[PDB]
Structure formats: structure tokens, C-alpha cells
Amino acid sequence: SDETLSSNPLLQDFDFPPFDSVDASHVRPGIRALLQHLEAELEELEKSVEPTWPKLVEPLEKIVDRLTVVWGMINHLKAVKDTPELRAAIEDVQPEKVKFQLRLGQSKPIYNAFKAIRESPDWSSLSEARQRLVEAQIKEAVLIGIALDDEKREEFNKIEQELEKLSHKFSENVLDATKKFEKLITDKKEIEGLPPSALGLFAQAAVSKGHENATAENGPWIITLDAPSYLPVMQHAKNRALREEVYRAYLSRASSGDLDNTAIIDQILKLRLEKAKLLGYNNYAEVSMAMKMATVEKAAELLEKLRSASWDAAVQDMEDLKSFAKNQGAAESDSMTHWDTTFWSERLRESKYDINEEELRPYFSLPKVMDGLFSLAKTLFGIDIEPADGLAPVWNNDVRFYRVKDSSGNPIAYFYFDPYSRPSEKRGGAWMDEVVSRSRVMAQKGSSVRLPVAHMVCNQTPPVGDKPSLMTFREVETVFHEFGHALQHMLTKQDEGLVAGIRNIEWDAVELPSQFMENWCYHRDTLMSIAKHYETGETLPEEVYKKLLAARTFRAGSFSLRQLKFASVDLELHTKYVPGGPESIYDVDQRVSVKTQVIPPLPEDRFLCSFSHIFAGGYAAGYYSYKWAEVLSADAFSAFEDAGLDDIKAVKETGQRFRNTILALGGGKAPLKVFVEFRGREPSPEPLLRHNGLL
Template sequence: MHITKTPTADDLRPFATARLDEARARLADLKALAPDAAGLEVCAAYDAIGRALNGLGGWLGIFANAHPDEATRTVAEELEQELSAFGTELSLDRDVFAALERVDVNSLADEQARRLIEHGLRDYRRSGIDKDDATRARIVALKKELVEIGQQFDRNIMTGGKSFKIAEGAAGLDGLPADFVANHPPAEDGSVTLSTDPNDRVPFMTYATRGDLRQAYSLACNTRAYPENLPVLKQIMTLRHELANALGFASWADYVTEDKMSKSGANAREFVDRVMALAKDRAAAEYDELLEYKRREDPSATDVRDWEKAYLSEKVKADRYSFDSLAVRPYFAYAKVRDGVIATSEVLFGVRFERNDEIATWHPSVEVYDVRSKDGGEHLARLFLDMHPRDGKFKHAAMFSTDSGLLGGDSKDEVLPQGALMCNFPEPKGTDPGLMLHDEVTTFFHEIGHLLHHLFSARSRYVEFSGISTEWDFVEVPSQLYEEWAWDTGVLQRFATHHQTGEPIPEPLIDAMRRAEEYGKGLTVIQQMYFATMSLEYYMDDPAKIDPVERMIALREEHLPFPHEEGTFFLCGFGHLHGYSAMYYTYMWSLVIAKDILSAFSGDLMNPAVAQRYYDEVLSRGGTKDAADLVANFLGREQSFEAFAGWLQR
């Protein structure tokens, strides 16, 4: 079995160059095949190009987003551009297209081989293989420019955080937990300084009692990468629109959704509108409750502002459900949560996670685990955990898929799947155990849900279908489904113990937490649909007719009860406008499917038989079948909207 050695800063360029050279050599092999080469021979030669590059994009993404050395991050970005350029060149290679087109698909008995040729031909047509030379040259130029400008957009967000100084020092942190205050010691002048990164932003906006400070801090958070990213975003929108037009599509939204489950921008918008209509009344009632609570202290209040939302929601939950989210933090020390998430995954899927301290990583805090069969014999996968914040690192939470697992005719053709989690959870230091909010525990389950999907999807002989290679609007299903385990009493009581007393988290506290979670989901859903609508509209219309700021404000006024805050430019720090482009709707699309899959567990999340069937029919299949077929095979029926509607209206 091939196991890719983790690259280092010193050998990153040779590592990438060797992969690209190998891919070019395999491309030459494919072109050298006889015109009457057997279909399976063409499939193997075509797949060999992808195998040469397997995981390279993921490794470069890790180094570009997480390596502590800025020069190394720059090298990784340059190599990402080279990889993208080769991908564009390959996608417009008429000789490769001709080789695939000569294969008689009906003569292929192997289902994966047929699918490989069919998808290859589809993707070549979507890339512009049939366009004239001038159009093809413009496509190449547009794709090159989009990679570079997209990197700039992401870089501005990563480095565009702001410092927020509280002159009155610790007094301005009233309402925050003691460990948060301790981790923000006063400067010589008595002031304390916050970053606008999530590890500071979420607790401060939720618990700080001083409304004036929350308002000012919210302004700082919502001007991240402003004004730098305003022209960058407009350029991304313009270039994508031109590229879509060159490829024969009316808009980028139509182009990017054509090969997804939604099939078109119009279908995606119809879905968003359907969910918005379903959530509207509940969201309005929840907003009224926030306003009613605010009026207890300010009887003249006429609205709730965005910077009050999290704080007031916390107060309403305490009032209605006697639940304080800070009360659960002592049960969620980082190391306990990490070990609990791992142990849950071991039991559920019948595997073992073994710590491996022999593997070099890109930062000393990164942990490595090997996943093995339950008896410890078979080496199934390797994962990396880069879980704590630091300067120059990606600011949110994500899974980076490196090597996709592959089957082979013999062991030398097999590839060990590898991947990494990149998060920003509290870091244990000294006597501070790194206490997490339950929202962060849920995020941990979410991201490892992505990672397990990638690592377990290793039944394919072709790299095209290995790893997370389903339609994009299915990608969030395994991750959002696994969030449910973070709410299960039995699961939590296995690992959530008080960091001082060792007492398991009490069942009444979990029950209160679950009841409180029901509050606010209407507002959460319409907020997500606002983001989805914004991302669709930016890419459905002609960018020349769109002022992104004006459209953002207009959509907020149309869909959200919280007024726009003058001087805020959320869109500049909304990284999904680049990475997901028009497809932010996929989070809710996937949640609808996840709620339906959840129903198969019938309340018993640790049911080994259902988990095994989920592994067999969904996780392990990768892209070997359409996502709708994966779901239908698991459920024994077509996917339904009913479970989601029931959850939202509960």
C-alpha cells in the first residue's frame, strides 16, 4: 500500500513538482495509446493522471492556510496556481477527450469504468472542449486569474482581522467566564485587547453585558477585510460570469449547479424560497420574543439589533428553560472532547484510532492518528488534528482532504487515505483545560463527520470517485448528520465529565440544553437562507448590474428582521462567496437529507447495525453512484422533505 509521506516546508516544492511531472508523463502515456485501445486500458491510463496528483491540492491547501512561516504559505499558493494551470490544460486537451470519446461505453461491463468515461466526457464538455481556439484561450486566462484573485480574497480574510481595545480593562469583560478573562490579561495601561477571530468573537457577543461594547466590537468584526475585498469580490463575480457565458451558460449559478443535485440556479433558488417560507412564521415569533425580553430593560425599544441577537437569545433560553450555556463548559475540556469524539467514532464504526507521534507535521501542536481495524491489524487511514488558533492560520473550522483512498489490482496500487481537521478550539495551557462551548463540541462532530466521509470512501478503483466525490450539495450530509451525536445523552455521558470533580454531565442539564436548542432555530434557518440567497443572487445576475453592498442590504431588509448596521460590510469577510460561490444553499439542502437519514436510527444513535448500513451504503461509496441513489439505497425509498419539516416545526 502506498502511504504518502507528509511533506515539509523544505521539500514542498520538489514534492509538488514531482507529482506534476508524473501527471504529465501519465498524460503522455494516455496520448500514446493506440486508437483501438481497449476501454479498460483507456480508463486505467486516464485514471493514472489523477492518481499522480491524488492529494496534492489538499497538502498545498494545508500549507497555504496553516503553516506558521509566511514564506512557506506563499510557496504553497504559487504551487496551487501551478496545479490549477495543469488542471485547466488537461480539461481542454482535445487528444484526451478524443481518447475517451472513442470508448464504447456500452461495451464496458464494469459500472465504475462506464461512469468514469461518462463523467469524463461530461466534464470535458463543461470545460469548453468544443469551443473555438480564441474562446479556449480566454477560458484558460479566466481560470488562471480566478485562482489568483480567489487566493487574494481568502488571504485578505485570514490576515484582515482587527484588534479591539477595551480601555476599561477587565470591567469591560463583565459576563464572560473567568478563563476568558484570565486569557486576556490587561496591558500596562490597564486595557484589554480582543481579536475579531471566532475564539474571541463568539463568547464576547454572547455573554458580554455591556451593549455599547458589543455594538462597537460587532462593527470591528463586520469590517474584516474591508475595504480590500470589495473590489476583489466584484472582480470574482465578473470573471465567473464571463467564464460561464464563454461556456454557454447564462450565469455562473447555472453553470456551477448543473452537475449538482439541484441541477440549476433556478432549482436552488426554489429550494431556498421553500425553506424560507416554512421557517418564516417561527422566526417571526422568536424575534418577537427577543424584542419582548429587551423591553424589560428598555420599554421604548422598537427593534432588536444584530449585535444584540446572540446575547438576548442566551437570556431568553435562561429565562424559558433555566439553561445557561456556560454551565456545560466545565464538562467539555478539550482533551476529553477530542477523546470522546474519537471513542464514539470507534464504537460506531468498529475501528481503532492509534496516536502516532513519529510523523512529522507542519506545526508542533498537530496530532496524528492512524485508523486501524478493530483488531488493530489493517491500517485503514491516517488523520491530522490541527485544532487550536495561532497567527497566520485559517480562522474557522474545515476538513482538508489529502490522499483519497484507492483500491488496486494488487497492494502496490492501493493508497492509504489521509486528511486533516483544521479548527480553532480553546487550547489547554497549564492549569487551563481549554473549556469548550457546546457549539464547539457540535462543530468538532461536524468536521470529523467530513473527515470520516473522506477516509471511509475508499472502495473505488478510480480516484475520480474516491474520497468526498459526491455532488457538492450532498457534501454536508455526513457532517451535519454527525452533529446529532453531540446532543445524545448516552454519547455525552461517555466522555463529558467535569474537569474538576470527574462527575459525568447530569442528564437534566443535557435535557435543558436540548430544550433550549429548540429555541431560535427559525431565526437560524432564515439567516442561513439569507446567506444562500445572497450567494445565489451575486452569481445569477449580470455583475455589471449589481452593487454587492446595496444588494446585501436589500436582501437583509427583505429576509431578516434585524436591521442593517450602518458601516458594516459582512460580505468582505464571507469566505464562502469565493469557496462555495453560488452554492451556500448546499448547507440547508444537505440538512434536509441528513434529517431524513437520521430517522433511520429511530432514536438509537449507537445502533451498530444501522451504522454499518450507513457506512456500507453511503460513506464508503464515495462518488461511485449519484447521491440520490446512495440515499435511496440506505433508506429503502426516495429521500423526503418530511423529516426536516417536522424538525423545523417541532
């Protein structure tokens, strides 16, 4: 009670979202008031509409922007600060929000004005960015069913409504399943082989479930399914029965009982196919491809090319594991299973390259990783990044906030970073999200542009007691990856808000700058700038750097095949699979797996039930987007190799070109063209193969 509706934080004008003052109780009133105001604005827009920027595109952006920013902030809070009250609130307003998105998207007065712009006799004189914007709006309106008669339209809107609901449900079941599993270890024997770091984590966990005397050394241990817990078990637990139990629990998350995602998946695929037919396509993959660089055929070709290049290496990887385990006298070497792979891969990796993950950890502290990352961004792209904590409200005390400046000391962008695993309330994985776009229209009166703001979110090993977060090499690459996305959002030079940043970039190109950044983790100057012992300040020894380098291509065939399995199963489920029939999604999984993994999945494998990328994310008939863009990213990196990675002048010159093409142009130019503008030619898959030793 107590406060006026008009004082609701979601309804105020703000520079940075009020992330510290918004909670579940604000959502129904704020969102319902907002939608009433936006309906009225849309009516005014339709009434005055003309095929010009001031009468069409500017008032449209003002409507889309407000919805995107406010809904975006609520969805962000659901992903990092989930509560039952926030879920119920979002579920109660989500249909009204979707209804409004459909109303807006299906506006005939807006659509007809965009067609009149496209049909103008001097179209060729309109700027490329504005051409891209108009073409995108026309194509998007058709994809949201504007061409359908009123009865088919009704059916389309009902499908859209149900898909939004199922996707939210899918992600809640995954969070809930990951949260639910807790394994209390009391007998020190069962945990044999877990390193100190993991021990320190499962004991810190132990405390907050009761058992308050618990220590790393001795006191009891709770094992969970979030990655920083699950992975060390699979890499290190000498107890094979514990590996098998943790594996089977991980593999069956959200696949039975109240959290089952199976029927949700079945319903999602059914509806996706109905939608495709309403729009005149054969299957949903064709719908997905309408907005992508690829076609189903071209995507399939690339996957099959990479698969062919990876297969013999993957077979040899399996034989190498068997040989190694057998030479250790391990009884399971005669019948290696999925719960042995990670474990023996890590033993092999240790023996073959003489590197121990646990001993590397002191050299990879988050504060030093961030310092080195920012120093690299300065070198490549000319920007200065500094902490600005206090400037923007945040949702948790671990959240960092930074200001990005150009060479003259002028702010050009900001970002938040929420770095640590928090499985009680925070979605798994790692991602980047937009907060606000760079926009001329949304600028304050008297200033030329609203500066862009991004989110970076990771789920890395938390700090243990008082020390900083100590990371694995994989966690470092993940930070670089998400930073790559943030840079494309933040460094954009488009002021046309609807094509700025990452907007309107064909989805199979959005993984270009993120994967590109990961290459620099192996660049000597970059790695050495980061790798300072957290207590001691001593730089990582040269010979250790050399072993890290040698280990880069370890099991590249198997890692490649794993990604190709994910991409192929996605494509297959959205092309040939017909839901409702005798064949289950798990049968599809088995069939596709015959050519994309060296041994079959267990019959009890339910990895699909956690595959949020394609059931609660932007990658439906799109998971291949990672590999498609990795070809581009690898080849982009080879431009630096060509120029000379040992020549700081050449590195800065090439970096500036990258900054002024891939990072600057947003979706205001076709991605193949932006790439050619940077590279000097069309892309080749040779760099990607060479980098991973798969030529």
C-alpha cells in the same frame, strides 16, 4: 543552498506527507520540477492512449494523484501555517500549476478515449463506479472548455487563471483583516460581564503583545476578532458601546484600504459570468448546477419552502427578545439593533432554560469529547480509533494523528486533527480536507490498496495554561461535523481512486454525513459518555442534560433564516445580478434580506467580504448545498429514530447500513440512489422541520 534539487521533499515518494520538513524555499524548485515531470508523463500517456483502464484511466490517475497530493499539502500549509514567504512562493508558481491543470483537462487524446468507452457496445456491463468515473471525466472536460475553438479557449484559460489568483487574494485579505484588529482593555469596567474563561483568554493574549504581568483576574486584556474572542464579547459584554464597536469591526473585515475584498468580488463575478457565456449558459449558477443534484429552480424551491416554514418563528424570536429585554428594564429594548441580538439571546437562553455556557465548559474537554466520539463510531460503524502520534510528521505540536482500524485489528485509514484557534497563521472556521485517497492504482507493490488519510481542522477555544481545551456545545458539534466528512473519506470501500471517498460526490450531497453526525450530540448515551467533569470525572447531571435537550430548538427560526439568507444571496449574485451596472453587491444584499431577515442589515454591513465559502471555496452558487444535504441528513437520522434509538441492536444494524451505503460508496453511485439504498425511499423535508420545531 546546500541540498540537491533531487532531494527536495516535494519530489520524494512518501507514505505520509513531509509536513515537518517542507517550507517556502522548497515550493518554487519542487513544484517547477514536478510539473516538468508530469508534462512528460502526460505526453507519454497521450502517445500510447487506448480506451482501457491500463492505457487511460490508470496512467491518468497517477498524474492527477501526484499533483493533487503535493499541491494539496502546500495549500494545507498555507491554510494552517501561513507566512509571507509561503504566499509569495505559491503566487509565483500558481499560474504554472493552473496552466498544467488546463493542459491536462483539455487533452483531446484523453477526452476522445473516454468518449470511446462511453460509446462501447457493452457499456452496460461496465461497473457502476467505472461508469460514474467515465461520465464525470467527459462532463468535467466540457466544463473546463475542451469544446471551445482555440480563440475562445484562450479567453477561457485567461479567465481561469485570473479566478484562481483572486480567490487566493480574497482568503489572504480575510486572514489579514481578522489578524489586524486588537483592542487593548485596561479599564476593568469596560469588560463587565465577560466570564472567567474569556478573561483567561484575553489575558493569555495580553501577555504575547507585551504587558507581561497580565492575568485573567486583573492584568490587562486584548480582544480579537477570531471567533473564540469575538463571540464571548457579543454574548456577554454588558458595555453596549463595546458590543457595537466589536460588531462593526467584525462586520467590516476586509472592506476598505489595502485589504478591501469588494473590487475582488466584483471582478470574480464578472469573470464567472464570462465563463458561463463561453460555455453556453445564461449565468454561473447554471454552470455550478451542471455538477449538482439540484437545478437553479429546484434549489430556489427548497430555500423558499424552508423560508416559509421559518419566517413566523423568526418574527416571534425577535418579539421574544424585545419582551425579555424590556422586562429587564433595558433602555435599548425600544430600539434593538444587531449588536444587541446575541447578547439578549444569551440572557433569554439562560433564564428560559436555566443553562449557563460557562458552567457547562468543565464537562466538555477535548480529550473526553474525542473518546466519546470514537466510542460512538465504534458502535455505529464498527471501527476502533487510536492515537498514532509519531507515525506521521506534523506541522505544529498541537496536531493529533490517529489510526483507524477495522474489527480484525487491521489499519484501514488515518487522520490528522489540528483543533485550536491560531489566528496569526491559520485560516478561520472548520473544515476537512483529503490528504490521500483510497486507491488501488496508488498502492505499494504487493498491497492491494493505498489506505486513505484525512485532515480535520477546527478553531476552537485554545487551552488556557495547563488545562485541556474546554468547549462550548457548538464547538462539540463542529468536531462531530468535520469527523463526519473524515469518515466518508476514510471508510470508503471504493478502490477506484478517482471516485473514492468524497470524490465525485455531487456537491449538494457532501454535507450529508457531516450534518448527520451532529445529531448524535443530543443522543443521551453519547452526550453522557462525553460530559465528564475534567477535574472530577463526575458525569453531567441528568437534569442538566434535560435542559440542553429542551434548548435544542431555541431560535431555530432565526438560525434557519440566517442560513437561508446566505444561500439566497449566493444564488441571486450568480443568477440575476449583472456586475458593472449601477447596482452594487451590497444592494443585492439589502434586497434579498427583505424576505430572509426580520430587520434590515446595517448599510455598513460588508459580510460579503469575508464570505469565503463562495469567493474562496467550493460553494459558489452552492451555499444552498448545506440545506439541501440537511434534508438528507435529518431524514437519514430519522431512520435511526424509526428503528429505535433506545435499542442498541437496532442502532448497530442501522449504523452498519449507513456505513455500507453513504460512507462506503463515494461518488461511485449517484447520491440519490445511495440515499434510497440506505433510507428505503426518496428523501422528505419533514424530519428536518420536525427536528428544529418548525412543522
